[PDB]
Design a binder for this molecule. Structure first.
Ligand SMILES: [Ca+2]
Ligand SMILES: [Zn+2]
Ligand SMILES: [Zn+2]
Ligand SMILES: [Zn+2]
Lengths: 480, 471
């Protein structure tokens, strides 16, 4: 009758192997570095397992032991020192918590660190070394993860997000805990299968053809044909052998049935597999007649690991007279400092962006006036308020350039309004974002143009990616 | 005892520097509120020193106001100019009645929103004291002289020498003229002659010394009450910028014009008396000698990040080699996050402003990490802050979180670097020798690759030599 004992912790990030930006402890602190007891009373996509356990503890069926919850925004690989420090802190907490019955981790699945290409398996395997084989070890994962057979063997069960945009974190956690409970009570013996679709492909879960595949997977779980099923869309920017789109199926003591079901959903994904220049996109933009027009620099979306400091669209806007216009948020902490030292109303030259690496392009020399200075701009992201920090607006030839000291994407038009710019009255509103800007902008846009990279000539060189993989190379074998 | 108010607000503004001048810049050089001017003289506080002395003599009651000066940099913030100008003007109000007001000004302070800082400050001073208080200022010969400034003060006296060594002597000359004006012995009449040119040369080189010696001659023989040759500062995009000659005569304006016209025309004659990055790259590329990029000296207001030099070194393969103290705070954040002996790519330089040039992309293995480096300068230990070292192909790069010039080769040493062993070796113009002496045989003053880049003056008067031909 003892309330089951359940360890919960979180360590994760979406590594862009091509980002020159580091993901150290500073980064985890900028987004999430909550040590035991510091986790707020609001849910996070990375801390789902803890939330449902807290809930089941209120229900009086669980005694949560909480460890460090760490998460960092998309960037380059984690430093060996940072990953090691957080990994060992969480593992020490698990030791001090012994004895436990269920261990449930919130992980991403695509965290790459220097010296570790299988970080999630390391943590889970180093966990079983302490808990033993009779404790239920499991983890929640982002569908943008890198699944390996090593990771599947490192845990009793792994449950991933079913939805992108990622909405189902708490519900997937409840599913994981339910399964981990049945595994502890010896009511279920998990048999698993991982199918490599030999492809890296991504589709939103709310539109066809993916909506029906995700639904059919939920139906198999409800009908009990599968204990749990996860479609791993993957993260193309992780240069690692485990990268790729995959399907993971678990069944109750029927591994052949897992392999068939996994193969069926994986071939449907392979079938759902469905050239553009920067200049053409700027020409298309110059042809727009319905304002406001939203220009999305998805190539420089910080939410995908980009630095958010490429100034090609800003340069193209001023050269092709795409004004009145606004652009942001651009990451140039030095430029924020210099604009602040100059003062509101100052007409001066500022070098903006082009500073982190080669994907940032050459900097833009702007002659303009400081038309805005804000000390702590924040935006509304799913109830939360992630900061832009000190922010500057410099206005040049009709372009209002918003520069931030904290790197982030644009989540709506209030970040520009904070600096005296009204995006609805603009001809063109350029955002460093991909799809999450649509949260706050709503119906403001009469047209949207996803802008291509100004550096399509610079090709990504992968060093550890599995070949053949789509769409990098043709795949002509499916039987081994 | 005559009541004399003394204060200083000054800076030599370079309109082409990307680093704005705010209170911080003044606090790091000279922000001495009333009662804090030390027992040593400065080139910006001539009037106060000369007064304090004349106070000992027992003829003056000096009321000292804020003495504020800043290192060479970009325009001053409007918020800072107003705070310092209004703090000073309030001290004069709280000190009335007074008989003489003497400011140590530079003359080439440009602020965002204000092109006539000195005249504005003088005009606001005139508004509080009245027309019967003797109001004057001392200025640098590298100043921007306007007729409005000449109208703003009863008399202005500039440095006569450069290197500037007469500040104290010029102060006594100014206070004297004011002490007289206050009495009524002189009714100063003046003329400002525009040389329609910008240039100048050491007062120890000819024919400047002669032009200066002749001017001192007029002073002592009495023909001119006070004379000043304003060489000017080309790096200030402001209409008042340029070389000019100002003559003072006792209630005789026509005489002033002729004297000013005489000295001025002469100044223009010396114009002739008053050059390739690559040309220099070759001279260095000889290696005859076993062991400055002045264009990028932090001491003169440059950001210290034009990596054109370092890029030319890897292109010439001038290694083994040393780079200098480079200001790229971010590069520091990254090099450290990488860890010691980290062979990773890092964008360094070309980040502060237009004069910083194209950044340098290098996957150099970092070879040094420091948490609080410092150099030794005349009893001061200026910080470099967090520091990193990175080697690519024989060249080692030193990146600092704080912008400072290289003083001694000890900085390179804290990063496992002995500049002596290197065949080629600094972010400095001349103060490097205070730690280098002659550890190296040859010395090449690298020119600016930005020579091609033409500062785009916006408010500069036209036409003006040497930019445009004149009549
Ligand atoms: Ca000084
Ligand atoms: Zn994701
Ligand atoms: Zn406004
Ligand atoms: Zn000077």
């Amino acid at each position: 009758g003892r309330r089951l004992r359940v360890f919960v912790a979180t360590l994760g990030t979406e590594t862009n192997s091509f980002s020159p930006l580091p993901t150290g402890l500073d980064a985890f602190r900028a987004t999430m570095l909550w040590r035991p007891g510091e986790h707020p009373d609001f849910a996070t996509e990375a801390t789902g397992p803890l939330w449902a356990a807290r809930e089941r503890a209120r229900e009086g069926r669980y005694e949560v032991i909480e460890g460090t919850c760490a998460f960092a925004m998309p960037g380059g690989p984690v430093s060996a020192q940072a990953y090691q420090l957080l990994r060992d802190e969480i593992l020490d907490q698990l030791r001090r918590a012994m004895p436990v019955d269920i261990v449930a981790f919130g992980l991403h699945g695509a965290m790459l660190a220097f010296g570790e290409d299988e970080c999630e398996a390391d943590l889970l395997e180093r966990a079983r070394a302490i808990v033993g084989p009779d404790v239920a070890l499991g983890a929640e994962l982002d569908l943008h993860a890198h699944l390996s057979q090593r990771l599947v063997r490192a845990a009793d069960v792994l449950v991933a997000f079913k939805y992108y945009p990622h909405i189902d974190y708490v519900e997937r956690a409840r599913d994981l805990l339910d399964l981990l409970e049945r595994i502890r009570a010896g009511e279920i013996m998990p048999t698993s299968s991982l199918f490599n679709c030999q492809m890296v492909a991504g589709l939103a879960t709310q539109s066809s053809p993916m909506k029906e595949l995700v639904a059919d997977l939920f139906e198999f779980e409800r009908r009990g044909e599968v204990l749990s099923g996860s479609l791993i869309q993957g993260f193309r920017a992780g240069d690692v052998a485990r990268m790729g789109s995959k399907v993971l199926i678990y069944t109750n003591n029927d591994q052949p049935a897992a392999a068939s079901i996994a193969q069926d959903f994986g071939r449907r994904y392979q079938a759902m597999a469905s050239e553009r220049s920067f200049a053409a996109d700027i020409e298309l933009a110059k042809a727009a007649t319905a304002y406001p027009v939203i220009l999305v620099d998805s190539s420089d979306n910080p939410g995908g690991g980009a630095s958010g400091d490429n100034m090609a669209l800003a340069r193209a806007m001023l050269d092709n007279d795409l004004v009145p216009s606004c652009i942001g948020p651009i990451w140039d902490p030095l430029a924020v400092q210099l604009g602040f030292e100059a003062g509101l109303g100052a007409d001066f030259s500022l070098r903006v962006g082009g500073k982190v690496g080669e994907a940032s392009g050459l900097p833009l020399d702007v002659r303009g006036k400081i038309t805005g200075l804000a000390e702590n701009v924040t935006q509304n992201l799913q109830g939360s308020r992630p900061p832009l920090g000190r922010v500057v607006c410099i206005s040049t030839a009709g372009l209002d350039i918003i520069v931030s000291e904290i790197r982030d994407q644009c989540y709506g038009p209030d970040m520009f309004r904070a600096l005296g710019v009204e995006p609805a009255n603009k001809r063109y509103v350029a955002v460093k974002s991909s799809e999450q800007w649509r949260i706050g902008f709503g119906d403001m846009g009469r047209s949207v143009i996803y802008v291509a990279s100004s550096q399509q000539s610079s090709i990504r060189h992968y060093h550890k990616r599995s070949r053949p993989m789509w769409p990098f190379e043709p795949v002509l074998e499916h039987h081994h």
